[PDB]
């Protein structure tokens, strides 16, 4: 009884709490004012993509954060929400990850096509078809996020399973299928797409150096660098997250001691913190490099006040 509790420093709890607060405010204000700011020849399309990205960021920040703070870090048990809360939460997370990844890859594609083939850069995707492609990204992401509605659930692990304080939002499915779905998310929402995006970034950079209306290159290069920053930040932030989930299953029960338990939890704090950092980092990467986005940002926040 009550063994389901987690040994975590109160100092660390308050730490990640404050951190999550900062990331929450910064990310929410950033992506929000970004979305209001978004409201053109080509940049309209990349504005739609950035719209999708900042939207996903807003989803994770607004919705996933307070759930994470309350139960995952502070409460531990019992799960206070409903099953729809759990399944919906994980589904939301995964869908957001897939959406983000697809947005990034598609952005790399459209950038490469923009710089290398300007003749086909106007005909390839009209804004209508672009929005259709965005909705396509959303729905596909949902389809890929579907397993979480089946994988995750609730189990009473109070030993007898009768004690109310033992209710836990946990994966109901077996260890094997768990390994399977974790692999699915790791490959499709991280490894493969970021690999493709990195490749397209390398090629874009090389052919950019090859290509070198002279002023236009100054803007497109800016685009490239921004993309690079986004990609590297993504991979570097999501890497321990996926490893943690791999760690979660690739370690046997006999190997699972209290040390690896608490360590897994501090690593959870760390990795998730890095995730929310990756969420809030986008508008900062936009403002810093673009300057114009920053001036109109300041203009709009001056409009609100």
């Amino acid at each position: 009884n009550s063994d389901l509790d987690v040994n975590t420093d109160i100092y660390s709890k308050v730490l990640v709490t404050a951190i999550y607060l900062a990331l929450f405010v910064v990310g929410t204000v950033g992506n929000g004012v970004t979305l209001f700011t978004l409201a053109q020849s080509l940049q309209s399309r990349v504005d739609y993509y950035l719209g999708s990205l900042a939207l996903s960021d807003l989803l994770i920040l607004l919705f996933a954060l307070p759930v994470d703070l309350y139960n995952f870090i502070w409460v531990h048990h019992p799960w206070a929400f409903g099953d729809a809360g759990c399944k919906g939460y994980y589904f939301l997370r995964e869908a957001c990850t897939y959406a983000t990844a697809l947005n990034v890859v598609s952005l790399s594609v459209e950038l490469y096509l923009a710089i290398c083939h300007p003749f086909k850069a106007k005909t390839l995707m009209s804004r209508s078809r672009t929005k259709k492609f965005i909705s396509a990204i959303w729905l596909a992401s949902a389809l890929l996020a579907i397993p979480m509605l089946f994988t995750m659930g609730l189990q009473n692990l109070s030993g007898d399973g009768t004690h109310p304080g033992g209710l836990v939002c946990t994966p109901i499915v077996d260890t094997a299928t768990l390994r399977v779905v974790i692999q699915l998310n790791t490959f499709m929402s991280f490894l493969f797409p970021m690999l493709v995006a990195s490749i397209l970034n390398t090629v874009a950079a090389r052919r950019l150096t090859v290509m070198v209306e002279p002023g236009r290159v100054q803007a497109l290069r800016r685009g490239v660098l921004v993309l690079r920053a986004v990609v590297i930040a993504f991979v570097v932030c999501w890497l321990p997250y996926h490893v943690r989930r791999l760690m979660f299953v690739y370690i046997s029960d006999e190997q699972w001691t209290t040390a690896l338990f608490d360590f897994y939890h501090y690593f959870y704090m760390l990795s998730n913190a890095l995730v929310y950092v990756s969420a809030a980092i986008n508008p900062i990467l936009y403002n810093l490099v673009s300057a114009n986005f920053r001036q109109v940002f300041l203009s709009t926040l001056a409009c609100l006040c």
């Binding site: 189990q155 692990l157 836990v168 939002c169 946990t170 370690i251 699972w256 897994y264 939890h265 959870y268």
Partner: peptide, 5 residues
């Protein structure tokens, strides 16, 4: 003792 989160 396997974690549940």
């Amino acid at each position: 003792r396997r974690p549940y989160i």
